[PDB]
Amino acid sequence: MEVIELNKCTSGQSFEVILKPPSDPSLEEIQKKLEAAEERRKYQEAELLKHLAE
C-alpha cells in the first residue's frame, strides 16, 4: 500500500492508496426533429377533423 499525493489543508486532506497496479447533434438537426414531430401531430389532428367533418 503506497500512499500518494497527500494534500493537506485546514478543511481536511486527500490522497490516493494503491493496492495493486494494472494487470453531438446541431441546433438545426434538433429543430428538425422537434418540427418533424409537430408536423406529425398536426397531420394526425387534420385527419381527426376530416373524419369529424364527414
Binding site: 481536511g12 486527500s14 446541431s26 406529425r40
Partner: protein, 437 residues
C-alpha cells in the same frame, strides 16, 4: 474559482434541489434571507462556496440554480417557502400543464414551447460566471418532465455550452413510491437521448432510499421529505469538494477523470454510511473501520445490486468528520482481505480518498442523527448494470404488446424511437458485460 450551475427539472428534481440547497445553506452558514455573516468579502469573492453561490451588493448569497417544471404547483411551494428569499424569481420557471407522465409530451409537445425560455434564464446565470465549469442536472427518470424535458435540455446545453461538463443526479423508478405505470418507457427514452450528453450520472433508486429509511430510520412509510433529506446528504457528500477547500474532485472535469474511464459507462454507484435515526436515545458512534466496511454492504447503496459479481473501474472514498488517513488505510487493509473487490485488469486497484473535517450537517428536526464521521463511496462497478437489466425487462414486457405506445405516438413521437432507445440500452448492457466478466 469556477462556477457550477444547478438545474432542477420536474417534481423530483425541484424537491431534491430544495433539500440540497437547504442543506448547503446550513453547511455554509447562509441564512434563509441569503445573508452569510462569516463572509467578510461583501458583494463578491472567489471562495470555494462561490462555486454555488453568487453575491449581491447587499451581501445576499443566491444559488446559481434554475428550477423548471411544466406545471406550477411544486415550484410554487418554493416561491412561498422558508427559502423564498434565497432565489430570484427569474430562476423559478413554471408552465401551466405538465407532461402527463409522458416522455413524448415533455420532450416534443410541451417541451418545444418552453426550451428557449429556459435557455435564456440559464444564459443569464452563465453571464454572471467568470469561468463556468458546467451543470448539475437533477431529475427523475419516470416523470414526463423529468424524462422528456431533461433530454431536450441536455441536447441544447451541448449545443450552447459544448465545452462544459454536465453531471446528472437521476431518480430511478421504484414501484414502492412511483406514480405512473409508464415510467419504464420514460426511463429508457431519456437514457437513450441523454447518454452522450452526460459526462457522469449518479443514479438513486427510490427503492434503495425507501428501504434505508425503513430499516435505519425506523420510518414505517417514508415520505418524499424523508427520502429527499437523505438524498440531499449523499448529494452534499458528492459536491462538497466543489464547495470546500481541498485537492480531490475540485472541478466537474475531475469527476469524469476519477470515476469514468469509458464515456458510456458513466454511472457510478453511491454508497453511504452511517444512516442513524435521530429518535434513538442511545447510539454508539461508528469508527472509521466500521463506516468504511459499510460502504461494501449492498443495504447501504443508492442502488441495490451485488458488486461482488462485477468489476470496479474506479473508487473514491469521501469522508466527513473525524477521520485521519492512517485510520482509512488501516480500514482499507482489513476490508481488502475480507471482501470481494475485483478491479478490471486495465485499472489499478486503489482508492482515491478525500477527507473533510467538518462532520456532516443535519437539518434541525430531521430524521438523521448527528454523527462524528460519515463516508460516501463513489465506485464505478459493472454491478450497477443490474438496474438496467431490471428496467429493460419491464420495458420489454410492455413494448412487446405496444401497451401505452399510442400516448407517445399521439404527441408526435415515432414508434421507432422506442426500439432505437431500447437497442441503445441493449448495447449499454453488453458494454457492461464485456467490461464485467
Amino acid at each position: 474559482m469556477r462556477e457550477c450551475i444547478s438545474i432542477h427539472v420536474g417534481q423530483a428534481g425541484v424537491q431534491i434541489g430544495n433539500a440540497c440547497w437547504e442543506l448547503y445553506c446550513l453547511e455554509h452558514g447562509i441564512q434563509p434571507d441569503g445573508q452569510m455573516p462569516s463572509d467578510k468579502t461583501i458583494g463578491g469573492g472567489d471562495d470555494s462556496f462561490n462555486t454555488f453561490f453568487s453575491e449581491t451588493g447587499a451581501g445576499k448569497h443566491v444559488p446559481r440554480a434554475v428550477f423548471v417544471d411544466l406545471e406550477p404547483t411544486v415550484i410554487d411551494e418554493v416561491r412561498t417557502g422558508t427559502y423564498r428569499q434565497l432565489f430570484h424569481p427569474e430562476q423559478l420557471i413554471t408552465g401551466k400543464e405538465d407532461a402527463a407522465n409522458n416522455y413524448a409530451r415533455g420532450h416534443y409537445t410541451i417541451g418545444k414551447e418552453i426550451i428557449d425560455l429556459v435557455l435564456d434564464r440559464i444564459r443569464k446565470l452563465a453571464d454572471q460566471c467568470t469561468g463556468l465549469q458546467g451543470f448539475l442536472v437533477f431529475h427523475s427518470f419516470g416523470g414526463g418532465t423529468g424524462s422528456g424535458f431533461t433530454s431536450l435540455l441536455m441536447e441544447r446545453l451541448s449545443v450552447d455550452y459544448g465545452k462544459k461538463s454536465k453531471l446528472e443526479f437521476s431518480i430511478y423508478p421504484a414501484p414502492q413510491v412511483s406514480t405512473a405505470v409508464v415510467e419504464p418507457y420514460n426511463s429508457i427514452l431519456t437514457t437513450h437521448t441523454t447518454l452522450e450528453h452526460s459526462d457522469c450520472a449518479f443514479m438513486v433508486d427510490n427503492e434503495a432510499i425507501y428501504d434505508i429509511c425503513r430499516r435505519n430510520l425506523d420510518i414505517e412509510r417514508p415520505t418524499y421529505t424523508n427520502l429527499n433529506r437523505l438524498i440531499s446528504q449523499i448529494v452534499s457528500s458528492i459536491t462538497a469538494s466543489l464547495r470546500f477547500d481541498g485537492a480531490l474532485n475540485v472541478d466537474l472535469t475531475e469527476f469524469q477523470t476519477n470515476l469514468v474511464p469509458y464515456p458510456r459507462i458513466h454511472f457510478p454507484l453511491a454508497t453511504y454510511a452511517p444512516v442513524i435515526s435521530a429518535e434513538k436515545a442511545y447510539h454508539e458512534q461508528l469508527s472509521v473501520a466500521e463506516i468504511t466496511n459499510a460502504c461494501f454492504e449492498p443495504a447501504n447503496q443508492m442502488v441495490k445490486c451485488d458488486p461482488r459479481h462485477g468489476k470496479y473501474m474506479a473508487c473514491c472514498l469521501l469522508y466527513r468528520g473525524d477521520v485521519v488517513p492512517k485510520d482509512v488505510n488501516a480500514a482499507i487493509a482489513t476490508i481488502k482481505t475480507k471482501r470481494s473487490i475485483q478491479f478490471v485488469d486495465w485499472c489499478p486497484t486503489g482508492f482515491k480518498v478525500g477527507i473533510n473535517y467538518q462532520p456532516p450537517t443535519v437539518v434541525p428536526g430531521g430524521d438523521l442523527a448527528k454523527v462524528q464521521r460519515a463516508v460516501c463511496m463513489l465506485s464505478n462497478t459493472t454491478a450497477i448494470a443490474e438496474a438496467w437489466a431490471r428496467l429493460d425487462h419491464k420495458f420489454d414486457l410492455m413494448y412487446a404488446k405496444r401497451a401505452f405506445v399510442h400516448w407517445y405516438v399521439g404527441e408526435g413521437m415515432e414508434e421507432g424511437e422506442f426500439s432505437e432507445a431500447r437497442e441503445d440500452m441493449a448495447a449499454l448492457e453488453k458494454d457492461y458485460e464485456e467490461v464485467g466478466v
